[PDB]
Amino acid sequence: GDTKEQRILRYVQQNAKPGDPQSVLEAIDTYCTQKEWAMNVGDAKGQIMDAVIREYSPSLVLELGAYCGYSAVRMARLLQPGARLLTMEINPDCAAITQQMLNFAGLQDKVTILNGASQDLIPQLKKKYDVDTLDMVFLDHWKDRYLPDTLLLEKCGLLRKGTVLLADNVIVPGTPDFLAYVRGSSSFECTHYSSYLEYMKVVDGLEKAIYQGPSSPDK
Numbered sequence: 001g002d003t004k005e006q007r008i009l010r011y012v013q014q015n016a017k018p019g020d021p022q023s024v025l026e027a028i029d030t031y032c033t034q035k036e037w038a039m040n041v042g043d044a045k046g047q048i049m050d051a052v053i054r055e056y057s058p059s060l061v062l063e064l065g066a067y068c069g070y071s072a073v074r075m076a077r078l079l080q081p082g083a084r085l086l087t088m089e090i091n092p093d094c095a096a097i098t099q100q101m102l103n104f105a106g107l108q109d110k111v112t113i114l115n116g117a118s119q120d121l122i123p124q125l126k127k128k129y130d131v132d133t134l135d136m137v138f139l140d141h142w143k144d145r146y147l148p149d150t151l152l153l154e155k156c157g158l159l160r161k162g163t164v165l166l167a168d169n170v171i172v173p174g175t176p177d178f179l180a181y182v183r184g185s186s187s188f189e190c191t192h193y194s195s196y197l198e199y200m201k202v203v204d205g206l207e208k209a210i211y212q213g214p215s216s217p218d219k
């Protein structure tokens, strides 16, 4: 009953060092570069993510779509003490892998893993996980859900002025409805970070969208 995700974790556990998040990232990256491709990894993309965390120093981060925990390790390793990552993952086996990955990296105390669908878990954050508002949201789950989960987040009052959204894969395989909305809306100040996919030979990108506050009613 062996899976690609079990193999990734196994490769880390064998080749990385426990409590060393950087060796974990490098292990995953080497594996996915040289043995078999996997979703939601990549050091080039990781550079942009790093820079965003470093610049805004969020205290509360929400990630949609943990997969194997590469991005959770990536972000949580830069979080200040007391800072927390909440990460959502719809597939229980992947949720389990993410947990073990984070444990191995030594970050399990910085991260809460939620196993469920985003539209189900997001409205529970205030009541169940003591969230007031989020400082940063990383989107890397199902692409057709970027837009409605962003609207859901706004709806639920989880966004504040200055909340950073960072969306992966907005070019490949692309999230046109999402891009059109956040760029067209006065509620988001948007920046595009291109990133080359060196082996598939194509430019992808991340979108950073800074929440500006709600659209105000007409006078």
Ligand SMILES: COc1ccc(C2(c3cc(-c4sc(C)nc4C)[nH]n3)CC2)cc1
Pocket: 039, 040, 064, 065, 066, 067, 088, 089, 090, 091, 094, 116, 117, 118, 119, 140, 141, 142, 143, 145
């Ligand atoms: C086919 O493309 C894919 C498939 C899987 C994924 C991943 C993913 C998505 C979710 C969802 S979906 C949803 C409504 N809520 C959540 C939390 N968790 N994990 C990364 C594994 C990303 C892209």
Ligand SMILES: [K+]
Pocket: 181, 182, 183, 184, 185, 186, 187, 188, 189, 190
């Ligand atoms: K905009």
Ligand SMILES: [Mg+2]
Pocket: 039, 040, 041, 140, 168, 169
């Ligand atoms: Mg991705």
